[PDB]
Design a protein around this motif. Structure first.
Motif, PDB file in Angstrom:
ATOM      1  N   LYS A  84       9.571  -1.008   2.615  1.00 57.43           N
ATOM      2  CA  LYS A  84       9.258   0.164   1.587  1.00 57.43           C
ATOM      3  C   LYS A  84      10.349   0.892   0.920  1.00 57.43           C
ATOM      4  O   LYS A  84      11.097   1.046  -0.285  1.00 57.43           O
ATOM      5  N   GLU A 102       0.611  -1.386   0.187  1.00 51.09           N
ATOM      6  CA  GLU A 102      -0.613  -0.135  -0.131  1.00 51.09           C
ATOM      7  C   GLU A 102       0.667   1.011   0.672  1.00 51.09           C
ATOM      8  O   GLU A 102       0.491   2.426  -0.746  1.00 51.09           O
ATOM      9  N   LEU A 103       2.393   1.128   1.007  1.00 46.41           N
ATOM     10  CA  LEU A 103       3.231   3.109   0.240  1.00 46.41           C
ATOM     11  C   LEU A 103       3.727   2.539  -1.179  1.00 46.41           C
ATOM     12  O   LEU A 103       3.632   3.766  -0.725  1.00 46.41           O
TER      13      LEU A 103
HETATM   14 NA    NA Z   1       3.221   5.847  -0.808  1.00 50.80          NA
END
Ligand code: NA
Ligand code: NA
Lengths: 96, 100
Positions: free
Chosen positions: A87, A19-20
């Motif tokens: 991420k 999602e990141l």
């Molecule tokens: Na993002």
């Protein structure tokens, strides 16, 4: 979009990490086993599930484990980890 | 050979690591402060000696402890890190990983 394969028994961390990531720059696939059948620009894989570029997740530090991973050409992250850390490591690795 | 700059206030780890490096593949420099001055293929720098205002544009930062914000901050600035415990074998293999 770079293809990122994420291998682990559990998926919360990986879902949040996906999602990141920028969806135009990274496409994620999630698995419970490292399928060498899948092409990927980067595999993130739990150590216990380890049989391209690979980033290995470890539960604890161990010198021989660490030395062997690095000689084989794998970078690693040791818990604890967060979606933001994962991420950022994926972005850094792929941009480099 | 590749050039590795080492920045630390405790030189024993680094000393032992240089001993393990092949001198025809790598030339080392070791200092107590970070100099953008030098051009190097890789910089290994202790976090306490890493200037707060810098980022890239290889740097490997050595951390005493895990802290989430600090780790996210380093990675966003373009720096990889290692948290202790660390050994000469680990350091040597990391250096080789980056520069191979
Ligand atoms: Na993002
Ligand atoms: Na995404």
């Amino acid at each position: 979009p770079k293809h990122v394969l994420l291998v682990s028994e559990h998926w919360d961390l990986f879902f949040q990490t996906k999602e990141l990531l920028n969806p135009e720059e990274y496409r994620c696939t999630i698995g419970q086993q490292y399928k060498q059948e899948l092409s990927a620009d980067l595999v993130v894989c739990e150590y216990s599930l380890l049989p391209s570029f690979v980033l290995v997740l470890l539960d604890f530090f161990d010198e021989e484990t660490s030395v062997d991973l690095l000689d084989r050409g794998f970078w690693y992250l040791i818990r604890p980890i967060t979606p933001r850390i994962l991420k950022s490591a994926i972005s850094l690795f792929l941009s480099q």
